[PDB]
């Protein structure tokens, strides 16, 4: 016979001891551990709600991969990617290039907690988290790998984060700030709670669903399986949050959440918004990016924050409004600057689409529809050279994303500047600037693409030089997804 898991589980996490040959601070340095005055005994209250043991882990995961890799191989010589909508294909290349290596990097984020968390249970769950991310990184390199011969763009599933292409810099700016350069407790708050539980867990669910609609059962299965692993480690932040509130650290906890959520939002608006609102065919659009956010992200955050006795972010009112524009700018920005990304941005501004955008968003054509009105005319009046840039867009020093807001009649684009120690910074939002001011020494000497351009680090100092600096060349350089097919509609 065998024991019931409940009878011996606590012993797997009864591993803390009183150091003697070295001091507690030496063994657990604050910069890595982040115990924040809270004692070892107090941290031991940490108790993950979802429990699992080694034998169970290797057994379940073995099965998940058997299925996933089996699906992939069965549909391998089917070449769906070929006869699939350019909007979808482009969606995948964007996903992989931005996520593969970051998934892997997260394995080190977990490893950070596995070694330096004073909470024994967090240390073990982080070890499983470490293995989860090791999996995601590998499986999301193995899958796109099947398409390297169809286009060099697929090579970016591995190369993107190794370049200085703006989106890559944006991705790294976020991740390094949330999970790679923060102490153990901070990581559980900002990555596992704020980002993995708050966004990616439900996101991946929709991606998998949408991928299913598209007819890509290989990619659908991929994301479905990976998503089932998320909760297992995403759970690590709640307990840390209770411990901090439980003790005298509610404020410190409060802003990590404030900061982490905004930053997750910014990066989220450029990579997910454009996707379900423009790259997705019209007859396959369930709800709008705004609808999706309110019903699957906004609500949960409110519920969650409530249960942990935390307050809604100070910027929450503004954040709620931006759901009506931010991802619209980000999109237009990416499509306009289409040759500077590794995937083909879709316009998604056909007659029907443009109205769809009007139903979901009040007065879209009176603002966003404007800019698109022009661009569409130039393409109708054979002047394609006016739909691409000849200059760099101003960049937010925090999210390293273009500073863009409401256009057209209801114009409102703003720039929340800030001068600190003989230097002028630019932020595409009030929250973005705030993230900077609450801790300057952390972002101070960093520099976005523009700062580098102005310092002479991009040479030659012209378009061709910037392209070569971002490691981009024809073949991978972006252009309109449907090859401008959507123009024949306007003559």
């Amino acid at each position: 016979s065998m024991l019931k898991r409940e009878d011996w589980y606590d012993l797997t996490r009864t591993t803390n001891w009183t150091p003697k040959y070295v001091t507690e601070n030496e063994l657990f340095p604050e910069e890595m551990s982040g115990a924040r005055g809270i004692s070892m005994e107090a941290w031991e209250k940490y108790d993950e709600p979802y429990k699992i043991t080694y034998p169970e882990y290797v057994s379940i995961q073995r099965e998940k991969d058997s299925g996933a890799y089996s699906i992939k191989a069965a549909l391998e010589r089917d070449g769906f990617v070929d006869r699939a909508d350019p909007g979808w294909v482009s969606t995948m290349q964007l996903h992989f290039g931005a996520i593969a290596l970051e998934e892997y990097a997260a394995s080190t984020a977990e490893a950070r907690m596995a070694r330096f968390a004073k909470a024994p249970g967090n240390r073990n769950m982080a070890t499983f988290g470490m293995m989860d991310e090791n999996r995601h990184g590998q499986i999301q390199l193995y899958f796109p790998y099947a398409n390297v011969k169809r286009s060099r763009k697929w090579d970016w599933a591995h190369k993107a984060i190794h370049t200085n292409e703006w989106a890559a810099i944006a991705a790294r700016s976020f991740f390094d700030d949330m999970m790679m350069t923060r102490d153990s407790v901070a990581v559980s708050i900002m990555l596992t709670f704020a980002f993995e539980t708050g966004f990616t867990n439900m996101q991946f669910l929709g991606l998998a669903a949408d991928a299913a609609e598209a007819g890509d059962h290989t990619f659908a299965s991929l994301i479905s399986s990976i998503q089932t692993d998320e909760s297992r480690h995403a759970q690590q932040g709640g307990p840390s949050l209770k411990i901090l509130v439980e003790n005298g650290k509610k404020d410190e906890a409060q802003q990590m959440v404030d900061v982490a959520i905004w930053r997750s939002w910014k990066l989220f608006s450029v990579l997910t918004g454009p996707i379900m609102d423009y790259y997705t065919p019209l007859e396959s659009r369930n709800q709008s990016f705004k609808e999706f956010m309110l019903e699957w992200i906004v609500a949960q955050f409110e519920r969650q924050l409530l249960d942990l006795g935390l307050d809604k972010p100070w910027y929450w009112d503004q954040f709620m409004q931006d759901l009506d524009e931010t991802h619209h700018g980000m999109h237009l920005g990416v499509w306009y600057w289409r040759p500077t990304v590794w995937w083909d941005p879709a316009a998604g501004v056909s007659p029907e689409e443009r109205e769809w955008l009007e139903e979901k968003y009040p007065g879209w054509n009176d603002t966003w529809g404007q800019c698109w009105d022009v661009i569409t005319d130039n393409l109708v009046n054979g002047k394609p050279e006016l739909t691409v840039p000849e200059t760099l867009p101003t960049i937010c020093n925090m999210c390293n994303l273009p500073i863009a807001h409401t256009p057209g009649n209801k114009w409102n684009v703003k720039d929340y500047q800030l001068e600190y120690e003989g230097r002028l910074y630019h932020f595409g939002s009030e929250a973005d600037r705030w993230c900077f001011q609450i801790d300057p020494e952390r972002y101070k000497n960093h520099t976005n693409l523009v700062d580098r351009f102005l310092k002479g680090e991009i040479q030659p100092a012209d378009l061709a030089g910037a392209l070569m600096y971002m490691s981009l060349e024809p073949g991978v350089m972006g252009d309109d997804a449907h090859d401008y097919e959507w123009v024949k509609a306007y003559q």
Partner: protein, 323 residues
């Protein structure tokens, strides 16, 4: 225009078709792209300084750490497949020896021996778990890190086997204090202080090179010979078939760890000066290992002989690596 390749761009130029292992494990770390500012933030953050000092400025040098390849070529998929099998075997031992009441026919003497020399290992194995998980996050290459990733899961596995067995022992001998005294034994029994001082000091060796050395080349071989070999041999002689075979099962993971550790050392010796660096580190930590083995084994029956065998066997691991 750029033409599509047959493999990842960084693997193009290879002679033989890249394996799954190579496809999903190579050149993954990006913090090594800019040693001046490893992370995409201010260059003065503590974590920027940590990586520059402990990863980049290590005396153990090489021009292309990403060239390292796991001799076992472990990948997440193959790891689970491999260990799921081993765990099915371990499950058999626990469940079926239980069925034949194996625990009730153990002598009182042996049970007390288990309370002092076996169950407290849960602390030592978790320390090894922390030890290797640090190597994961500070090594200069992703192929090096993954070997650390998997070894870390193995240490958790050893911890887990121990926690389970400890519960079973507490059920069968509720008076001994199984599950309740391990910490006190680990912290106060002279037999464990040798090992305790060794891993506690080793756990604060932040240089990736010294960490690898102190943990995988000095401490682990010492822990494996003392616990898995000596106590495991003793378990066999005392008729504790379960522990005897459990030890043999865990030795298979220990062997895998020695294999990749051996390959890393071999690659390091390609560069002049690294052997001296490694030996200097080994000369630094070997003394604490000796004390660990001495304090632990001296307390076991046939102690002096066990001490000699363990010192000899652990040293041999390093000799076959060229030191």
């Amino acid at each position: 225009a750029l033409k599509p390749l047959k493999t990842w761009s960084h693997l193009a130029g290879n002679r033989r078709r890249p394996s799954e292992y190579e496809v999903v494990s190579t050149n993954l770390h990006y913090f090594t792209d800019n040693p001046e500012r490893p992370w995409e933030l201010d260059s003065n953050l503590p974590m920027q300084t940590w990586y520059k000092k402990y990863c980049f400025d290590s005396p153990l040098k090489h021009d292309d750490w990403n060239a390292f390849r796991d001799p076992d070529q472990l990948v997440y998929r193959t790891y689970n497949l491999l260990q799921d099998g081993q765990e099915s075997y371990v499950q058999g031992l626990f469940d079926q020896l239980n069925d034949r009441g194996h625990d009730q026919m153990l002598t009182r003497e042996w049970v007390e021996t288990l309370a002092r020399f076996y169950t407290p290992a849960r602390y030592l194995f978790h320390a090894l778990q922390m030890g290797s998980v640090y190597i994961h996050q500070i090594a200069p290459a992703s192929t090096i890190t993954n070997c650390a990733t998997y070894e870390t899961a193995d240490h958790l596995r050893w911890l887990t086997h121990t926690a389970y067995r400890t519960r079973e022992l507490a059920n069968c001998y509720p008076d001994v204090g199984f599950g309740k005294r391990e910490r006190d034994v680990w912290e106060n029994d002279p037999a464990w202080q040798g090992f305790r001082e060794l891993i506690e000091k080793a756990l604060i060796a932040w240089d990736w090179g010294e960490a690898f050395t102190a943990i995988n080349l000095v401490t682990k071989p010492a822990v494996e010979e003392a616990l898995l070999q000596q106590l495991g041999s003793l378990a066999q002689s005392e008729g504790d078939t379960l522990l005897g075979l459990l030890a043999q099962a865990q030795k298979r993971d220990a062997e895998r760890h020695r294999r990749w550790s051996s390959a890393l050392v071999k690659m390091a010796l390609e560069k002049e000066g690294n052997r001296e660096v490694l030996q200097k580190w080994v000369a630094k930590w070997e003394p604490l290992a000796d004390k660990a083995i001495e304090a632990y084994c001296s307390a076991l029956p046939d102690g002096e002989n066990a001490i000699v065998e363990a010192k000899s066997a652990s040293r041999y691991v390093r000799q076959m690596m060229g030191l």
